[PDB]
Design a protein around this ligand. Structure first.
Ligand SMILES: Nc1ncnc2c1ncn2[C@@H]1O[C@H](COP(=O)(O)OP(=O)(O)CP(=O)(O)O)[C@@H](O)[C@H]1O
Length: 280
């Protein structure tokens, strides 16, 4: 009933001051906190952080899931476009997973709140940053499996950070999966063949692009979940967002290629988005 010690990551409880609630999810809660000395380069400095922890109604699975999410985040190096693990309180008390704080909340709500305010370039920038994050994550041989606007967080300075590593897996060929992945963001091979590769994340990235350019629109609007399985198999794809250029639309469509190897890689998406951003 204990958690093994990992000194590299342990943070003293007496240096953490819990603050306002940030959000309640399915299996846990997140609260703002002040952490003193969590940056080992500035040992007396107070830093605002986010703390993930169990709720009073936690299940056994919630605990093991939170531990597993922490362990996944440990394996992922630091990157500007991902929410990084800062430390954890794992001994002699409730499990606290301490991560970077993003003051502007999740991307879906951020965009929906700025509907007529975002410029087109701002949207392309957002997309570019997220491609860069995914390129990094793929380079670390991590498949996210839950890429979506609700799982991107935005910092005070509008840096886009990929978050929510609960479903992410280390594949240092392909991860083999009743499915627990949000259906509207899943590549067909994930949905039908229980197979997951970096190219499955690329499909998800395409849905994310659609969410971004529709300023937080809901995917496959009006289609009941049970029908989506059939429609996806038959080649159904969403319409071009109004905000979108031909170039960006073709990019989304390519992310939704039926053949995984025919989708762009994240490296290719970053290269293309860099260019577009530059010419915008
Ligand atoms: N590092 C952070 N900084 C600021 N807010 C955060 C945060 N991490 C999480 N939140 C917010 O805390 C809430 C709970 O998110 P959480 O990831 O725990 O559950 P969830 O069920 O919403 C998974 P999903 O990411 O698929 O929505 C959300 O409102 C989220 O936006």
């Amino acid at each position: 009933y204990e958690l093994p010690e990992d000194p590299k990551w342990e943070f003293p409880r007496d240096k953490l001051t819990l603050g306002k609630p940030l959000g309640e999810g399915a299996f846990g809660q997140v609260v703002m906190a002040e952490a003193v000395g969590i940056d080992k380069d500035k040992p007396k400095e107070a830093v605002t952080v986010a703390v993930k922890m169990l709720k009073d109604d936690a299940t056994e699975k919630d605990l093991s899931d939170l531990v597993s999410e922490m362990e996944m985040m440990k394996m992922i190096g630091k990157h500007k476009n991902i929410i990084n693990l800062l430390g954890a309180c794992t001994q002699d008390g409730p499990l606290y997973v301490i991560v970077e704080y993003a003051s502007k909340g999740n991307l879906r709500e951020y965009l929906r709140a700025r509907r007529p305010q975002m410029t087109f370039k701002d949207l392309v920038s957002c997309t570019y940053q997220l491609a860069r994050g995914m390129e990094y994550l793929a380079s670390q041989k991590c498949i996210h499996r839950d890429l979506a606007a609700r799982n991107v967080l935005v910092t005070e300075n509008n840096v886009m950070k990929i978050a929510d590593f609960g479903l992410a897996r280390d594949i240092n060929d392909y991860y083999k999966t009743n499915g627990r992945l949000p259906v509207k963001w899943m590549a067909p091979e994930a949905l039908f063949d229980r197979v997951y590769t970096h190219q499955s994340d690329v499909w998800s990235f395409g849905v994310l692009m659609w969410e971004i350019f529709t300023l937080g629109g809901s995917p496959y609007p009006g289609i009941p979940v049970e029908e989506l399985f059939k429609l996806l198999k038959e080649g159904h794809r969403m319409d071009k967002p109004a905000n979108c250029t031909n170039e960006l639309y073709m990019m989304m469509r390519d992310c939704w290629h039926a053949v995984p190897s025919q989708r762009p890689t994240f490296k290719q998406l970053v290269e293309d988005l860099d260019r577009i951003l530059t010419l915008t």
